[PDB]
Amino acid sequence: NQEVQIPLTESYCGPCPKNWICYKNNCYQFFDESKNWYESQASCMSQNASLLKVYSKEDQDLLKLVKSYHWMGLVHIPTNGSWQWEDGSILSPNLLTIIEMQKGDCALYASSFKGYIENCSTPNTYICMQRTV
Amino acid sequence: ESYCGPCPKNWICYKNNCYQFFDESKNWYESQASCMSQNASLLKVYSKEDQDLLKLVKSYHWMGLVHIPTNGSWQWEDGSILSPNLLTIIEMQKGDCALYASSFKGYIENCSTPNTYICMQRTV
Amino acid sequence: EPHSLRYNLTVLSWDGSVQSGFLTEVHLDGQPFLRCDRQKCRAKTWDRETRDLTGNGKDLRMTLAHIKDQKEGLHSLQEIRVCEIHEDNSTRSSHHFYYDGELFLSWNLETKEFTMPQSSRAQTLAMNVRNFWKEDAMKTKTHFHAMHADCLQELRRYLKSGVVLRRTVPPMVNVTRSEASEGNITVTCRASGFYPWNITLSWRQDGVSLSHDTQQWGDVLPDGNGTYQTWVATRICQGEEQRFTCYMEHSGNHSTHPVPS
Secondary structure: OOOOOOHHHOEEEOOOOOOOEEEOOEEEEEEEEEEOHHHHHHHHHHOOOEEOOOOOOOOOHHHHHEOOOEEEEEEEEOOOOEEEEOOOOEOOOOOOEEEEOOOOOEEEEEOOOEEEEEOOOOOEEEEEEEEOO | OOOEEEEOOOOEEEOOEEEEEEEEEEOHHHHHHHHHHOOOEEOOOOOOOOOHHHHHEOOOEEEEEEEEOOOOEEEEOOOOEOOOOOOEEEEOOOOOEEEEEOOOEEEEEOOOOOEEEEEEOOOO | OOEEEEEEEEEEEEOOEEEEEEEEEEEEOOEEEEEEOOOOEEEOOOHHHHHHHHHHHHHHHHHHHOOOOOOOOEEEEEEEEEEEEOOOOOEEEEEEEEEOOEEEEEEEOOOOEEEOOOOHHHHHHHHHHHHHHHHOOOOOHHHHHHHHHHHHHHHHHHHHOOOOOOOOEOOEEEEEEEEEEOOEEEEEEEEEEEEOOOOEEEEEEOOEEOOHHHOEEOOOEEOOOOOEEEEEEEEEEOOOHHHEEEEEEEOOEEEEEEOOO
């Protein structure tokens, strides 16, 4: 059963793109090629994926270990005066602490569960996420 | 493959290696025991290419590296040698155990000092 | 004067061995607020503070390990960060590194650049440290900016939640006579229990401030209650006490105080 780690309770993780991080039915990859938010999104979508979406501290607890600052899929709409993901879902409360660093309409992820408001035009490393089956 | 594993249910899989991170500070002995209780061992660094994700780890965490003063060399808990050109070792605290830190660094720390730790399954 | 938040982080080495312990002093509007170690923060629960400041403590232990250091015994490395919010809602920043109690490195938000003192032992320490941060991309421009942005969010959070260890307290004023000798008297004007520190206190003859040199001046002393006290005295002829008033400005309050009787 599920209170122990033995070869019998092991399973394959995926499906994910080749040589990606697979965790709790999610796929992730980190790109060290600095790009602005638009190019970062385009890169993720070119690989049938999107920028990091944060939806659960439990399911995505590995985000606590990430060094440095990376584009995630969070964008500001000035009309509603609120943050939301690429896929148009709302930022759930008590997930991210959002910190005004630069005046901008995009956010960089940093551990633990922070978003730093950054100029969309500024080159940064980025994280792609794909949800499995 | 599109598939990574086999790994425990709720572990991180990368290039068919299984990893988990523990926020509950333990000394090196308790950290190793905790990893073995979960059918794993403390992080072993064997390949910069296969374990390139270790570049993105924030802070420092127990790994499975120990000093025996007789042979005067660092080795893994499984008795395998530290391969050259993998880790730069830095004297931080006097001790016979090592903390992993980005990028492929090992900080010498007292074995008795509580620290966060990373487990990696022995598929070695 | 501005709202401020200061984080004073100290790590220690004994004979090149970096100790497990570190400590963060947090000061809010100049007042001791939190002391934090690896385990806990304590005021004079604090969970979010312990997470943040344990992170910086570990980075600073690693930083002290990369310092090449022939001299034996005790050495200390400090990272001291302050953010300020002013009247006009403009903000200031400083970010300094001290080794054995001496500055060797600052980071400047406006320019996004390191500054070093002129000393050559300052330049050695600074390059030990900068080269360490560069090899591992450990402390980038962005990390320095983010630490400053968190400093401002926390200060705002403390202010929004009414942890505001600051309010005006106007002085109590008392005028007394003394040293009644050879048909002269000392007149003394005392301001006590006052906050903030800044005050104007002056004797006037027929409403004209006497020179500094014809007056005697208390220092501005802490009460031990969070407030201040001071005084000014002058030497006049008996019979002339009507012509002498104590003038005081504190906190927009301009008042005048005669010699009693």
